[PDB]
Design a protein around this ligand. Structure first.
Ligand SMILES: Cc1cc2nc3c(=O)[nH]c(=O)nc-3n(C[C@H](O)[C@H](O)[C@H](O)COP(=O)(O)OP(=O)(O)OC[C@H]3O[C@@H](n4cnc5c(N)ncnc54)[C@H](O)[C@@H]3O)c2cc1C
Ligand SMILES: Cc1cc2nc3c(=O)[nH]c(=O)nc-3n(C[C@H](O)[C@H](O)[C@H](O)COP(=O)(O)OP(=O)(O)OC[C@H]3O[C@@H](n4cnc5c(N)ncnc54)[C@H](O)[C@@H]3O)c2cc1C
Ligand SMILES: CC1=CC(=O)c2ccccc2C1=O
Ligand SMILES: CC1=CC(=O)c2ccccc2C1=O
Ligand SMILES: [Zn+2]
Ligand SMILES: [Zn+2]
Lengths: 230, 230
């Protein structure tokens, strides 16, 4: 049996370092004989806003709209917006979910944040109780491929931007692990725009190279200690 | 003389605890005689996507689209989308910027993330010469008024969600401090949905009451130590 992979891609320019790191993952994983699917959010013009338009049935409480309550109900009633369910299908079948994106304000670009806000709804990605170790999407793997504007030094404990693991907390722990995902070590391609053509090629190569043995990797200890190191 | 406050509001329902917190802020601040403006993102159906549409006119390089470069150029060129500039006019005139939003995946809702991604562009919010303590928007105050689903205990250093100061890093340090803002201690109305009518009123009341002396408040030492250290 093989593996299914979903690459949530968030970048406007196809000729970008992000586009390349995505094409690379597709080429490599496909070469391995893996089933690959890519969600080019910008190309799809994915709706980032969480509104009442995400529910197609009668609202539970039309007087006071509570997005969480409504989407949770909609998911169970199979009345969620189509674009939401489409992504949920790809995630449900995936064994590995890779997020390819440029660092936007120490987090993910708005279009990607919307993906996470609307797709990973209650009932699908988690329950109460049913998060973190017992998240509904448990068993699946997750990996963040982030390119940055700042350099590696900038992202050290004593660096101006602080340790890179600090901003990974919301994404890796608060989102991914919360949904049950097993987080693999993030892939951070530091300051490509500053790097030389050769250094860039090295970063792209390093990605492909790592992917060759991606299925043999063990997930990181998604704990507060891993991110902050007390 | 006088004070200007911009409240970037991010919530779908006017009858929500978030709507109430925003309304109260408008009340107290207006009572104080302050100049108050509110950006109801959802009502405005604000565009969270950072696309080429954000630039009006000829792109500096239409062959390869680089958002940060295109926008920075468009800012200096006065070729940015009106919806972005409008928000920039408000921010530039404000003395205090309050963000009212529910916690979405240890961060801000996608619509709000978009506001931060598109409005706080290079040339306006920051620039190679100035960031963090030398950020372009230096001198201005900033405050995050966030409501959470999880209780306070869940947000302790030894809790499931970890210390609240952890998820605040990317927002307070990575975004606000990066632009030069003076970050005031955040206001976190923990699990309002779970709280009793009595407890909630206490949360709302604490919000307005705090607003009475906001101008006498000292900006928190936005350091890594503050967020993670002891
Ligand atoms: C809204 C916003 C917020 C931001 N927030 C942050 C932040 O919080 N922290 C931070 O550090 N940075 C930040 N930045 C910067 C952002 O992280 C970088 O712009 C981004 O990571 C760069 O990646 P890119 O794909 O856009 O690269 P590109 O601009 O495409 O640069 C890559 C270069 O490599 C070339 N190239 C493409 N493919 C290949 C290939 N296969 N081999 C060799 N060369 C190739 C490209 O053509 C180009 O010359 C922000 C920028 C914006 C617009
Ligand atoms: C995509 C998504 C991601 C999420 N991620 C997180 C996360 O990372 N962490 C986390 O902890 N939670 C998370 N949540 C939950 C979210 O943080 C909470 O649902 C939200 O903060 C609750 O705030 P609210 O304004 O919607 O409250 P409401 O649902 O409006 O509840 C307030 C209650 O008080 C009533 N009320 C209204 N006005 C007043 C008033 N003036 N005085 C008294 N009572 C009043 C309301 O009608 C209601 O009964 C997430 C939810 C979603 C949809
Ligand atoms: C927040 C931020 C930090 C960077 O180091 C950086 C470097 C180069 C371009 C943009 C950015 C940016 O927006
Ligand atoms: C991450 C997260 C944590 C909560 O405590 C919570 C509570 C109620 C609804 C949703 C959430 C949520 O998404
Ligand atoms: Zn974790
Ligand atoms: Zn800071």
């Amino acid at each position: 049996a093989g593996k299914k992979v979903l690459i949530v891609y968030a970048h406007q320019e196809p000729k970008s370092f992000n586009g390349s790191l995505k094409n690379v993952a597709v080429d490599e994983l496909s070469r391995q004989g893996c089933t690959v699917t890519v969600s080019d959010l910008y190309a799809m013009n994915f709706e980032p806003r969480a509104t009442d338009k995400d529910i197609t049935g009668t609202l539970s409480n039309p007087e006071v709209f509570n997005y969480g309550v409504e989407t949770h109900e909609a998911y169970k009633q199979r009345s969620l917006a189509s674009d939401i369910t489409d992504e949920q299908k790809k995630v449900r079948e995936a064994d590995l979910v890779i997020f390819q994106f440029p660092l936007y304000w120490f987090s993910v670009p708005a279009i990607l944040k919307g993906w996470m806000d609307r797709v990973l709804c209650q009932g699908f990605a988690f329950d109460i109780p049913g998060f973190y170790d017992s998240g509904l999407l448990q068993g699946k793997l997750a990996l963040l491929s982030v390119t940055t504007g700042g350099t590696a030094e900038m992202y050290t404990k004593t660096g101006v931007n602080g340790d890179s693991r600090y901003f990974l907390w919301p994404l890796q722990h608060g989102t991914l692990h919360f949904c049950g995902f097993k987080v693999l070590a993030p892939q951070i391609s530091f300051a490509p725009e500053i790097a030389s053509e050769e250094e860039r090629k090295g970063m792209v190569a390093a990605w492909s190279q790592r992917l060759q043995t991606i299925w043999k990797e063990e997930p990181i200890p998604c704990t507060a200690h891993w991110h902050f190191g007390q």
